Design an enzyme around this catalytic site. Structure first.
Site, mmCIF file in Angstrom:
data_model
loop_
_atom_site.group_PDB
_atom_site.id
_atom_site.type_symbol
_atom_site.label_atom_id
_atom_site.label_comp_id
_atom_site.label_asym_id
_atom_site.label_seq_id
_atom_site.Cartn_x
_atom_site.Cartn_y
_atom_site.Cartn_z
ATOM 1 C CB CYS E 49 -1.088 5.466 -2.417
ATOM 2 S SG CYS E 49 -2.616 4.405 -2.905
ATOM 3 N NE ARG E 123 -4.411 1.359 1.200
ATOM 4 C CZ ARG E 123 -4.278 2.287 0.248
ATOM 5 N NH1 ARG E 123 -3.047 2.575 -0.234
ATOM 6 N NH2 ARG E 123 -5.350 2.908 -0.226
#
Lengths: 241, 244, 244, 244, 242, 244, 241, 244
Positions: E49, E123
């Site tokens: 991330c 995601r």
């Protein structure tokens, strides 16, 4: 279990067919300013029910003096009702003067909850001049009622209402206070102190106060119902039937 | 309205907490061969209820001699029950010898229909008379402004016991019925043949095939019953307030 | 499990019977500008509850001086409530000045969820702290076997009222916090532009952009909270048992 | 309203992830024969919660002496929990040795009822005290704007284990009760015969048959409990910010 | 087995809390004339991330020149967002310029279907136009980082097609059949089909497959630059300087 | 308002009729130990879809190298699928060697959640990447109006198969990440004791305990992945339209 | 708007209390190989009902020679049933010999659907064969008494049809087309219709209308006698005593 | 069981197709001030049904004299009804002059509850006698193996109309009742005053208060009703099959 009207609840509203005509309840008595006692029995041409009808009829002047009407109730038709009343007048010699509701089908019996399969129990409902249920008794098929206790109940409820008092056990022969009547207990601590500062009443504790406000005529009419219940009959009605 | 158990039903089975301990109903009393009168009252430290408990206490020997136990019931806790009973004994002079069920939360009261429309909070004064077999025989519902006549309760159980043993029905105002006095009623015929046979035979005093009677009760039984009613009609010669 | 009203919610509206009268909640108190502490107990004439009533009585003028009233609750009748208060006043010598709810059916208890797995019948030791808008600010649930610490409940109302008027949050163990003492915490920024501006304004003592505080409490406010704690820690010079 | 576990109920069984590993509750502590205090806080990297962590950490060996483990809970991830712990050790100098449950979804928060009207997103400040049998003994609910008093949680645990071990109840404000001081209370009689036997035994100090007490606690037990309250009442010598 | 919003629908209406303040989606952007890319990530202070955020932040003037805003989304607290942003500035040397949504409890995550097969979103990427309509959705897993230059290619190619009324061939601006050509929407009747082939207005392989070359040399070179960038090894890695 | 399959779920079991025969999904591929790429398209004999078939056909040997099969899906019948691939072969000069599911009625499309608000009649451009155990690994949803970049799908499959054999997570823009280039990421510690054992080992390059990486990929793995992207970025040498 | 059991259906199984004792229907009569006619009435000690009881009693021997029993039904009690039979015996001089169901409450009437558009049943009549099966149902109103001899004509004809395997013409035994003739059940197929017309064993008007004369002169004059009694005015009226 | 309309109910409102045309019931007859007899029949071209249409047709004048109309019913079509009436007029020489409802479907048969357990397909032999107000007066249900006695249906409508005008009830077997002959019954008193007023007035012949009667019907009405029973009992002079 099984469902009943309750004390403090008004009598359920209904139109009924009696052997004196069609009346609506409780409104028919309410409009005259009268209390009524409604009693029920399992079947016309039945022995214990017949002993009770006669007891009520002998004590009829006694209910009238108090301003109370009598109305009975069975699952039999109006025709059986009238044939039954004539058999009592000719065989025992006593005229039955008050109405009986005819309830074949048992509609009124279910609404009042008197079904304890085909025939009602010996239920009693005592109902005041605003049409509120004040007491109920349920005796069974095999035991007659004591009718002078019903006279005692009704007389002592109307005296409590008029003098703003509660009525002790066995009145007017109560073992603690005899013919005394009870002040309704205080419900706050301030009210409780105020009462004791006054020495206005006879007093065992702030919560057990009492006085003697009933007329001698009230106390001795009540005791006379119990005196009569206790006396051996001078002459049995069977003897000249 | 409200749901109540009915005459001829078994008393609902239940464990209850009393001021003498935990018991199972109706079995506690069925086990001993005894009948029981369960009576209920709205609240502890209230004046009509006090008068009633004192009245049942005075008659407790007479209940014992029939074979009858007594158990009370109210919505207060066992610690109030115990404090109320010390009060009665210290001030009135009388010991309450029988148990009282502590029903806080009102579970037993709801189970029995003791909650009426004269109060969300406190039970009416209901009475259930229950036989040695566990069966409901009579229920009275007196309101909170009026005390019971406890001598009528003794007259009920004595008359029910005579009726069961002698296989008879009991007339109005027994043993002082105006038509037949201390007599007891033979259960009426339910068939045409049966009603003819009753009449052929000629064994009972008789007003019609459905109204036959005899006098099978002993003079001790009749006299015991007249005693309860004479006592209810008599003014007590010494009142208990006189010495508190 | 069981249902309970929540912190941030208005107190459930309801009419209740007390030994001072009928009242409506939370309105009876909202209408006077008052906070209230409602506390509950499993029954009258039981020892731990008696100790807590005597301890609340002792502190009663401390509550009033904060603008806060007290009301109890248990499952017994107003008749037991008034008997038990005369007992306390006779034997311990302390008059109990605040009202007690009579909840003989457990209705009020079921509305508040004071009925816990300990007992079918009598309520736990529950405490609702309610502010002048009728809003629940704090709840504590002590069990039947353990009494409350009443000086901690005064610390809670004192601190809440300070936080509300000074627009601050209150550190653990105030006014004796091991990090900032008697300091009070400025509510944290919730944006990056707010976080940047607070550490550049330079207006407060600061450990990180999310931990700033100052000292805006009075000497009097502070001393008054330290007093409650000192009274809790101190052994009493005389016990009330000694002269009962 | 909202739902909750109740006192006397077994802590709900559940598997949870903490910054020390995955555990089953209450089994992980029951299986070691240990009590635990589970406490919850709305969010990592906020000020009041940080004051509380530091306060529980400082009293950590005090809980270990009593055989009590400590476990925290919030809605943030294990990653934030570990970054938050490093910032406290580095900037306040206090390291935190107990685990913290990660609940990023509020699964456990809802299960325990910790989601009040103050926020659909972050828990209130709940405390559950759970014994070595997995039973809920006590619950406290403080809101976001007010830190707990940690010394009172230690007094609670202590007095509950004393109760259990002596068969005694614990009066208000113990060991500093205004009626009986450090005395502990005998459970009251529940029947009339038990009550008379207790009055005639002369075995206890007695204000009534329902209020008896004695002084069975050791001096260590008593002086340990009062030391917690002393510490809570004392102004700190050196504040932690001064060397931060 | 899970319940997402769909291409062609309006982005669901909601209000949300970010580390820049409270906003209303898609209205906050609709009322500025702006498209937005909302991307989601499982947890703050995690490594794949952090790579993705620094990658969007490096291409941020690229989205802005295009009229596209960026907005992240994760299950952590706003206090966590700011602390995480601060670490990335202090250690990697890169400032994160755009807002991130705080979603503890996961209410926004569920409304969008971002819980796949317990606790942290996957995601997800939603691409939403200036009318507020979902145009494209991408679902990469926890263990695989996104190619951010491909999301720039999608946004550039949709706006071009909206503007010029054309559809876009596979692999544009390098399609193997028609190169940088754009496709004419196909005939839907037999008469339209015959007239289209009668005009001879377009290059044409059948009445259903015609194309032209109406994109500007600037548009096509900007799209090519995004792809050349994704294929080029950086000369200097940001780790080298931490 | 659309329900779909989910990453980490097993691909939904189903029998499908393709232009090569009936097959069983995901079992056909699983039992060969193969990965599969399932993509869908609106309609036969539409232009954007024809562009995509050609690009997947050109890259067919690339997918064969990786041990991945291709399967197509549209709402038309097997008879048009075959007519359609004859047209592509004779006018573009390119053969489509992979099967296409014939799905009139959108039974397979609804079950896959591929019917989107753009159309009541025709599927979106959905892509499922499915691993050798039959589990969904990635999903992309392009509209009717915009074709896919097939080279990125190649990149996704190479990278996922590499993460799986090496036990590593894959950075944004891999193998040209702007922080670690072609380095691969160690899955982060999940406990404090774990976090510090990683930091004590010097086993990995680290920017914090939660961000460690190394370079365990072969030169061959790395150059393969970059070549897909080198290709997507090259202007075509000759267009297939010109000699067609 | 009301739920009755149906022709061809088994009579509902039930245990009923009658003034002869508790019995079970239809088992009580099926056991004996008896048919039974059950008929109902609104109320004891009402005048149309009494005229009907007296009418069945006078015809009781006719129903017995056919092997048919009789049982009544009304919502009153066994007690008022027995007293109602005493009154009729005493004043009219006729003894009621069959049982009546006591149905206080309505339970049996509801099962049979005998309450039409409050408290008492209508005059329904069910005729039930030796297999327990409902054969015919008749519903006359409270204001109109039944014709009893018609019920014997029905019972007699149905038993003749069963034993003879024949259907019975309108007005039998005085049908205007074939008089005392009885009808052969019609063919139901084209080949049975051709055959019947070939056999030529029966008098015939079309292949669906054949008949013969198989009843004995005794069966036939017994049915006529029921009708002649109906049409004849009695020579002495019972009220005359 | 099955569901019927009931004595005392208004006849179910319905449009029906008969072989004379469409009509509305009961209004078509209510509009003309007429009674109707509706009677039903399992099937056209059956023998017992035929005998019954002939007996009604003979008595046509007797019904119209009373102001009563006839209407038949079966589950066959109008075409079937028409052909069956042409068969009877030609092979028996009797014209059927009333309408028959064609009810193919059993829509009207079901609504009247005429579908019995004798048959799945064809109606029972049911008759509804209906008065000028629309109200059902009497109902009869003969089976398909037994034909009706049509002279009793004439006695019933006749007796019912005399009941209505004279305000009398009608004894068993009227006009040949064995207790009172052609006498009619006064409806019984419903109250005690009313029983007694009636007995002492000399107004009626009387057996008891509840059983009073008189002879208000004229010799024309008595003789007309005895004549229907006379004809029922008469052996016919000529058989109709004789000249057919």
């Amino acid at each position: 279990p099984g469902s009943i009207p309750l004390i403090g609840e008004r009598f359920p509203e209904m139109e009924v067919t009696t052997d004196h005509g069609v009346i609506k309840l409780p409104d028919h008595y309410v409009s005259q300013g009268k209390w009524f006692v409604l009693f029920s029995h399992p079947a016309d041409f039945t022995p214990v029910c017949t002993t009770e009808f006669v007891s009520f009829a002998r004590r009829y002047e006694d209910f009238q003096r108090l301003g109370v009407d009598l109305i009975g109730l069975s699952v039999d038709s109006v025709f059986s009702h009238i044939k039954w009343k004539e058999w009592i007048e000719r065989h025992i010699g006593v005229r039955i003067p008050f109405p009986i509701i005819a309830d074949p089908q048992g509609t009124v019996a279910r609404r009042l909850g008197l079904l304890h399969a085909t025939h009602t129990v010996r239920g009693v409902f005592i109902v005041d001049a605003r049409g509120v249920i004040r007491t109920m008794l349920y005796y069974p098929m095999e035991l007659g009622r004591l009718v002078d206790e019903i006279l005692r109940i009704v007389k002592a409820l109307k005296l409590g209402d008029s003098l703003k008092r509660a009525v002790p056990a066995d009145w007017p022969n109560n073992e603690i206070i005899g013919e005394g009547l009870i002040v309704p207990p205080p419900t706050t601590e301030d009210q409780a102190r105020a009462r004791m500062e006054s020495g206005q009443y006879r007093c065992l504790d702030w919560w057990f106060c009492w006085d003697t406000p009933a007329s001698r005529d009230d106390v001795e009419e009540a005791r006379r119902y119990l005196r009569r219940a206790a006396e051996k009959p001078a002459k049995l009605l069977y003897e000249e039937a």
